């Protein structure tokens, strides 16, 4: 159908079109053991789908996809919630494309329905092949695409391959002002022919449409890299800080990836097989061997480092001048007689000729090391080392050890980290070690993700969560990727921006990975 | 007529006196008290722009009648009035949330509630039927009420010169709106109109200098926050840290400290400021007398700035000496803290007895940075109920009451000099005296017109209930004097997001 | 109605009665803005209610309540889940009392419906007053109580006071064998006149009927009391270990109660205002004062101890012979020059004449303490002290400081704790301190409760969660109270029972606080 | 009533509305010793009233009054002149608000009728109360 309305002032028209590029395959639900209807009003309450909106500016290139929505119960809050207690679904959705258009100057949108097991092309030219509609920003106000449930089975089960609605720019948006944009929302409502199949117990870990994050300030969320010092700030350093593997790498597909753990309390301790050997250069260095409880020493697949124990980053070229600091102690009956602060290198002095590495090979500066003993390790800090740059060093999986890939943020955004300050141990003693203050940053601490690891994360969607702080209300919008690297849209200088740790996150909406955040953090200071 | 959800007409069978209304109160053109908001390019998506409880406060008239009546039952037809353009593009979502449910803070969830999406292109005169969701035959006062929440869904872009869209709602009760139970009109439910007596600002009292008249009102772009404790008021009192309705009578205090002095100076004797309340110095009541200056900045001991006051030992109530004495407000420096209120006060005189009670009457500043330093009040210890630090909404600036503190030299090297400093104040108590009888409706802001001389010049500021005035200004040049020989006028209740059509350029 | 069936073998009868002690108030839903129906099958799928079952043995005393179910959407999985997207409900439920009866010998059950704002009496004698039914175990198989939605409002909103179904023993159960019991389940299904009112967005923190706990072994959940040593076991000591206030006291009404925190990483550090004074007895002791960041020193309402810092329990009478051990260090520019292990008492040497207390008053054994400095604290262990008994000492709120009440378990059950081992620091040095190995136990670490703090906990219901361990499958059933003290049914000797920390919890069913667990842990070793 | 015309070039619309926020109290003139009619054409010749025009620029502040016209014979040249030879008048006037508008960008006007012995408020917010 069609319907046209004269805009206020008679300076244009707004077209609200009901369109069905119609597969319109309505199943008889003959094989469904029972057919369950919905509250008639669910068909009448059109709700924003997870994935909208998408802003089409002048800097958008036709052929770049903007929406990729799988026609499923997840397009609606109420159907998404109802599906938790239902084995199968069967029916389409009426998807509305609300476009904040105007007689701006020009620009055309193309929306198409793509059937299952058909790759989504990246050109407006190819989209015209599919069943599709075209819009004109000069007159676009609505488009009720009657999206069908393209299927070869008489009713769906979880895990099937579903059809997709793809929206792309047909013609570039041209307007007098470079700031003119077009916010394009998209809402769904199940069609009348949409029914469920069976009543099954809800999944207590259901992939809920709405994610609830407890009002937990990050100063209580603490802390993979330095689990003895609380998080005090939130760092946004635009130094191209592509986070090489570290501790505290959690993703909600597997949980803890790399050598990350959910209980890093302290700075997870480890012991060593303090083997000894002739040492060139520094005789006072002894090559100790990390032991691997729960990961026996001889599995190239498993990590050659105790779970938890991880960077500080050391073992740079100059590792022989900049070191790490850890408590050490001879293991004796019932514990350790005495524990001091010795200088741990964890790197590439002589025996590996490597860079920073995740051996299984450490050097102490204590000459009292003996082979006939196991020595305890508790990292404390760095000694004489640079600050905030030599503590983010890049050791990596120089092996088959399944580790965390070096994650880099998408262009235009920089990582938001959880920081913490490490005090310096001074000693005016004839036998001691000297540390230097250092600030430590990390990705999402496990406490924040605990809700995500249970609440759920819709496939291909990065959570957009807010950040409110002390009065007056000030909200910064961050993006929390499933791989576990929260980011924020950045613009301006490259200053390391501190954001206070007092303030709680809040779920706003599921957004696609390529979703520019409206709120931009300005690097002024 | 766009109805988000059907209105359940209730037969008031359980109403002791089903009370009718004037048949002519039904005209869907009466403005909605507080229902005026502006959308700009800077309004981020999903920012709550309006929130009205579905109640007799939605109409200018039923709001007035509601003071006579203990109950009501009915809906409201709100008409939009969008002063948009041909070059404006954007969306609004207006959802009616159910009574007890909590208003979301993202559009993705607000869409869940019944709603309508409004284009600025075709939402100029859109009737919206707001229902009154209930499980009871009629409402009493205090019952949880439904709300309609207007929120920007697609930000406002402009195909041409960026313009500001001003929107406001006009309502008439649906034919089924009925009152009940006549009661005397002294109730809650603040009046839709607040008549401000024509008291010029210079007739009010500067709470932070109740000895010098308010000489001028001035807007400073730099002063982004107000940490003052003395001079803060709110209509929803409550208690505000060290603010009194009588600033003049509270400017006094007794002090007494034992043998003690600043390490850097054996001349700055300590002084424990006496409290009109009684000890212990319990960390739940103010640690200083209800009225005392909030001046000074976070200096460190040595060749520095500090305050001046009139001090004098008490003599059994009889004759007490008096003289201006240099005064600094605590040695927070020696504890690694900033200058706060809890810190004991000091006096630069070696002639204080370890057990004597000395008067103190602040009078100025000496050898000190200019007004910039007295503006920033000492911090607080975070244990008692003090006035929270506040800042104006983005793009808006404060309005302060200003006064001139006269200086004071000394011919002899016995007293103390005192540089002249212009002092500020967030609000004089003389303006809220009339407000309390009226009150502000449900977290709305009061747009007041400062009618400058003759009425040819009329400035508009928003009187936020929290206790401050703000006026939107585009400009540098911190100093901006506004004459204090004017008078206020109520213009309307405006939602906090409302931005003033009048913009006073700070560069003129 | 009624219906009788001849049991197999014709050795009895089983009565399945449909009863309506009928308020039967059906609302017209006139004021409801809209009326939403359900899938017709929800009315036909009777599901176990949260609160059943309840076993009526010979040791049950008439007048002891067994069921107290508020007639609400929460009586059914599907209605409980659907109510998440609904503002109001209006209608009753058909509650079935399935009784595993037999012609055992005798015994009668009484079930009554109690209207809102009417206290539940504790005598079968009074229950007969209410609308009620009586059962006989000799012939009881079912009872479809048509429970009405007693209300004076035309449809419900969350938070109203609801009616209650109470089941009590009318006559004692007598049977030939002392082991004969009667498992009494109870299921619900909304009546046909049950409808919802409005469609509202789901609460992302909804009080879900089913609780999902991630497959997180407790050896990763770590650890309030000793957040540097991982949890290794699970202790069940029947020493009457009524847990006085401690660290790690979390309840899902407020979150962290007492001085408990969600980020105890390490052993939350604290500093001191190392004031000095003349000391009698031991001159080498110096009375240091804990500073209170975020809790200024002068609020009798707030705790006089830094958040996190907490027991080890010291300050017993003999505190002058048994002590705690914490790292100490003079605070200097940028940190601390040197840090050693000194002996911290935290108790009642001279200045308080108290027992263990939660001052704000500590004694070091280092004579080098000086007033002009702040000294750091990091608890490590105990020195010369008893083990596992003097580390559970009972300091408490000797003041108005809102603390955690001393929780004791119900009779017949003992606490299940999260343990950990603290190594001993030995030192053969002319200046050092000597510790003694000690095992430390705690209540639920915050990681386990994180799901509860978001998943939800139905009012008055203690979660019954399982514990599966390495193959072959072995399941122990524990009860996790809302106040935050997991317990397990115990029988036999008083041996401290260790349960391996490898194995994950799992939600089984919501049960009442007075719900004997069928599985009994046997104290054999 | 209402009436809409498409502006030249079809780049807008011009609304010419006939509105009566209607007291519409028509007297029977029973007590009038005699009732005198006018030349029928006086009812058909709309003349500029004394007090118009008023230019609403960007520097105008809502709440500032612009017109305050007392409904009387003085609103028309011819009625004002005729009243010189007449002891009394009885009847209303059809007042036209010609606005030199355009699809400029925006801006809304409010006109209200205020009864006798009622002070004129200085806020657009209050004007909505009156018939307007």
Q: Exposed (0-12), middle (13-18) or buried (19+): which is A240, by Cβ within 10 Å? A: exposed
The single-letter DSSP state of residue A321 is: T
Using left for φ > 0, alpha for ψ between -120 and 50, and beta otherwise, residue C434 falls in beta
CA distance linking residue B48 with residue C485, whole number of Å: 42
CA dist A518 and A521 (Å) reads 10
Contacts of B110 in chain C (CB under 8 A): 201
Nearest CA in chain B to D124: B491
> Cβ contacts of residue B506 below 8 Å, gap of 6+?
B219, B221, B397, B473, B474, B475, B476, B477, B478, B480
A423 contact C CB<8A = yes
Touching, B vs C (3+ Cβ pairs under 8 A): yes
Task: Search chain B and give the residue with CA nearest A4.
Answer: B122
DSSP character string of A464-494: EEEEB-SSSP-B--EEE-TTS-EEEEEEE--
Q: What does the alpha-carbon distance between residue C96 and residue C93 come to, in Å, rounded to a whole number?
A: 9
How many angstroms separate the CA of residue B393 from the nearest CA in chain C? Answer: 28
Alpha-carbon dihedral of residues B305, B308, B314, B318, nearest 10 degrees? 160
Calpha distance D61→B450 (Å, rounded): 11
A517 alpha-carbon distance from chain centroid: 15
Chain A residue numbers with beta carbons less than 8 Å from the beta carbon of D99 are none
Question: Which residues between 10 and 39 in chain D have a beta carbon less than 8 angstroms from any beta carbon of chain A?
Answer: 11-13
Quickly list DSSP for D106-117: ----------TT
d(CA C158, CA C87): 7
Q: Do the bridges between strand B397-405 and strand B216-218 make them parallel or antiparallel, or are there none, so unpaired?
A: antiparallel
Say if CB A92 and CB A209 are below 8 A apart: no
Number of H helices, E strands in chain A: 3, 33
* β-bridge partners, A289: A273
User: Chains A, D: CB contacts under 8 A, how many?
Assistant: 12
Evaluate the CA torsion angle B101, B106, B110, B116 in order and state its sign. Answer: positive
Method: cryo-EM
C-alpha distance from B8 to closest chain C C-alpha (Å): 5
- Helix ranges (DSSP H) in B275-416: 371-375
Task: DSSP letter for B344, please.
Answer: P
Q: What is d(CA C293, CA D11) in angstroms, rounded to the nearest whole number?
A: 68
Question: H-helix or E-strand containing A14?
Answer: strand A13-19
By the 8 A CB rule, do B77 and B127 touch? yes
- A210 in Cβ contact with B109 (< 8 Å): yes
Neighbour-count burial of C177, counting CB atoms closer than 10 A to its CB (0-12 exposed, 13-18 middle, 19+ buried): exposed
Pick the closest to residue B133 from B194, B55, B208 (CA basis): B55
Chains touching B, CB cut-off 8 Å, 3+ pairs: A, C, D
Rounded to whole angstroms, the Cα distance separating A93 from A86 reads 17
Angle value at C-alpha B253, between B247 and B254, nearest 5 degrees: 170
Instruction: Give me the DSSP letters along D22-65.
Output: ---------S-SS-----GGGGG-----BTB-----TT--TTS-
* Residue C347 CB contacts under 8 Å (≥ 6 apart), including other chains: C314, C315, C316, C319, C354, C355, C356, C357, C363
**Segments of A57-173 assigned E as strands:** 67-70, 89-90, 93-99, 108-114, 132-136, 140-147, 164-171
Tell me the C-alpha distance between B485 and C403, whole Å: 57
Cα separation of A363 and A359, whole Å? Answer: 11
Q: List beta partners, residue B309.
A: B325, B362
Q: Which of D7, D122, D128, D130 should we substitute to test contact with B (largest number of B Cβ atoms within 10 Å)?
A: D128
Q: Are A39 and C196 in contact (CB under 8 A)?
A: yes
* DSSP symbol at D129: T
- Which residues, in sequence order, are CB contacts of D116 under 8 Å at separation 6+? none
- Cα–Cα nearest to B501, from D51, A286, D61, A325: D61
Cβ proximity of B427 and B468 under 8 Å: yes
Question: Which distant-in-sequence residues (6+ apart) come within 8 Å of C408 by Cβ?
Answer: C242, C243
| Closest CB to C266 among A34, A201, A266 | A266
- How far is Cα B328 from Cα B310, in angstroms, rounded to an integer? 13
Contact B21, B177 (CB under 8 A): yes
Q: Which of A3, A6, A7, A8 to mutate to test the interface with B (most CBs of B within 10 A)?
A: A8
Residue B502: its chain D contacts at CB < 8 A?
61
Supply the angle between the helices A446-455 and C446-455 in degrees, to the nearest 10.
50
Pairing verdict, β A424-425 and C335-336: parallel
- Coil, strand, or helix at residue B433? helix
Tell me whether residues A329 and C261 touch, CB distance under 8 A.
no
Give the rounded distance of the alpha carbon of A16 from its chain centre: 37
Query: What's the rounded Cα separation, in Å, for the pair C365 and C383?
Result: 12
Could you tell me if A300 lies within 8 Å of chain D, comparing CB atoms? no
CB B30 within 8 A of CB B168: no
Distance (Å, whole) CA D22 – CA D116? 15
- φ, ψ for residue A186 (rounded to 5)? -155, 125
Contact B41, B158 (CB under 8 A): yes
Pair C251, C486: CB distance under 8 Å: no
- Chain C nearest CA to A114, separation (Å): 30
| Pairing assessment for the beta strands A89-90 and D13-15 based on DSSP bridges | unpaired
Residue of D64, D105, D108 with shortest CB distance to B85: D105
Long-range contacts of A327-333 (CB under 8 A, 24+ apart): A327/A376, A327/A377, A327/A378, A327/A380, A328/A364, A328/A366, A328/A375, A328/A376, A328/A377, A329/A375, A329/A376, A329/C425, A330/A370, A330/A373, A330/A374, A330/A375, A331/A271, A331/A373, A331/A374, A331/A375, A331/A376, A332/C426
Spatial separation of the C-alpha atoms in residues B69 and B63, rounded to whole Å: 10
C112/C188 Cα distance (integer angstroms)? 15
Q: Please say whether the beta carbons of B475 and B505 come within 8 A.
A: yes
Query: How far apart are alpha carbons B96 and B116 in whole angstroms?
Result: 9
Which among A196, A212, A454 has the least Cβ separation from residue C214?
A454
Residue B125: alpha-carbon gap to chain centroid: 33
Within 59-118 of A, beta carbons closer than 8 Å to B belong to 77-78, 98, 100-105
H or E segment to which residue A448 belongs: helix A446-455
Chains in contact with D via at least 3 Cβ–Cβ pairs below 8 Å = A, B
- The span from the CA of C167 to the CA of C127, in Å, is 9
Contacts of A11 in chain D (CB under 8 A): 11-12, 103
Distance CA B301, CA B479 (A): 31
CB C176 within 8 A of CB C105: yes
The candidate with the shortest Cα–Cα distance to D11, out of A6, B175, B106, B330, is A6
Spacing of C-alpha C366 from chain mean position: 42
- Name residues whose C-beta falls within 8 Å of residue D53's C-beta, 6 or more positions apart in sequence: none
Q: What is the DSSP letter of C297?
A: S
Is the separation of the CB atoms in A135 and A122 below 8 Å? no
In whole angstroms, how far apart are CA B204 and each of B196, B214, B219, B237, C240? 13, 7, 18, 20, 69
Residue of A nearest to D14 (CA): A9
Torsion sign, CA atoms A122, A125, A130, A135: positive
Task: Give the single-character DSSP code of D82.
Answer: H
Nearest CA in chain D to A10: D12
Most D CBs within 10 Å, among B86, B162, B491, to test the D interface: B491
Q: What are phi and psi of B500, to 5 degrees?
A: -75, 135
Taking the Cβ of residue A178 and every Cβ of chain D, the question of whether any pair is shorter than 8 Å is answered with no
d(CA A233, CA A217): 11
- Of A350, A355, A432, A352, nearest to A390 by C-alpha is A355
C58 with C171: CB under 8 angstroms? no
Tell me which residue in A210, A263, A334 faces C437 most closely, judged by beta carbons: A334
Measure the CA–CA gap between A124 and A65, rounded to whole angstroms: 9
* Whole-angstrom distance, CA of residue A97 vs CA of residue C408: 60
User: What is d(CA B101, CA D63) in angstroms, rounded to the nearest whole number?
Assistant: 38
DSSP category for residue A455 = H
């Amino acid at each position: 159908s069609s319907k046209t309305e004269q805009v206020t002032g008679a300076t244009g028209i707004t077209q609200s079109t009901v369109t069905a590029p119609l597969p319109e395959a309505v199943s008889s639900l003959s094989l469904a053991p029972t057919v369950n209807a919905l509250d008639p009003w669910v068909y009448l309450n059109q709700t924003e789908v997870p994935g909208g909106t998408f802003t089409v500016s002048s800097a958008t290139q036709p052929g770049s996809v903007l929406l990729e929505l799988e026609i499923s119960p997840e397009l609606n809050l109420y159907t998404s919630h109802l599906f938790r207690m239902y084995a199968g679904w069967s029916g389409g959705f009426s998807l509305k494309l609300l476009v904040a258009g105007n007689a701006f100057s020009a620009g055309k949108l193309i929306a198409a329905i793509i059937p299952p097991n058909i790759e989504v092309p990246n050109s407006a030219y190819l989209l015209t092949g599919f069943p599709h509609e075209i819009l004109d920003f000069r007159t676009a106000d609505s488009m009720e695409i009657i999206a069908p449930d393209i299927k070869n089975i008489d009713y769906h089960f979880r895990g099937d391959k579903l059809g997709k609605l793809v929206v792309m720019v047909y013609s570039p948006l041209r307007s007098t002002s470079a700031d003119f944009e077009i916010e394009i929302k998209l809402t769904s409502a199940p069609l009348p022919d949409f029914k469920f199949t069976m009543l099954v117990p809800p999944i207590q870990n259901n992939a809920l449409p709405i994610w609830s994050i407890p009002q937990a300030p990050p100063y209580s969320m603490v802390n993979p890299r330095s689990p003895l010092t609380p998080v005090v700030e939130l760092y946004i350093n635009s130094s191209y800080a592509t986070c090489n593997h570290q501790l505290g790498r959690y993703t909600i597909y597997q949980g803890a990836i790399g050598n990350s753990t959910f209980n890093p309390s302290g700075a997870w301790t480890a012991t060593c097989t303090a083997e000894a050997g002739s040492v060139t250069g520094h005789p006072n260095w002894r090559y100790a061997l990390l032991d691997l409880p729960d990961n026996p020493t001889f599995d190239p697949t498993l990590p050659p480092v105790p779970r938890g124990f991880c960077d500080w980053g050391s073992g740079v070229k100059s590792g022989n001048k900049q070191h790490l600091v850890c408590f050490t102690g001879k293991k004796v009956e019932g514990g350790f007689q005495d524990v001091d602060t010795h200088m741990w290198d964890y790197g590439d002095n002589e025996t590996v000729g490597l860079d920073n590495t995740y051996q299984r090979t450490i050097y102490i500066k204590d000459p009292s090391l003996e082979k006939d003993a196991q020595y305890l390790v508790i990292p404390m800090g760095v000694s004489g080392a640079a600050n905030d740059d030599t503590v983010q060093v890049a050791p990596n999986c120089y092996g088959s050890w399944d580790y965390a890939p070096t994650v880099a943020p998408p262009l235009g955004e920089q990582f938001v980290w959880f920081r913490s300050q490490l005090p310096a141990s001074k000693t005016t003693t004839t036998s001691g070690v000297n540390s230097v203050p250092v600030n430590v940053n990390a990705l999402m601490s496990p406490d924040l993700m605990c809700s995500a690891y249970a609440s759920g994360f819709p496939l291909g969607k990065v959570a957009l969560l807010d950040y409110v702080l002390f009065g007056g209300s000030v909200v910064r919008q961050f993006k929390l990727y499933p791989e576990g690297y929260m980011t924020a849209n950045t613009t301006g200088s490259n200053t390391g921006f501190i954001i206070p740790a007092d303030g709680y996150f809040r779920f706003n909406s599921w957004v696609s990975p390529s979703f520019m955040i409206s709120s931009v953090v300005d690097l002024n200071l």
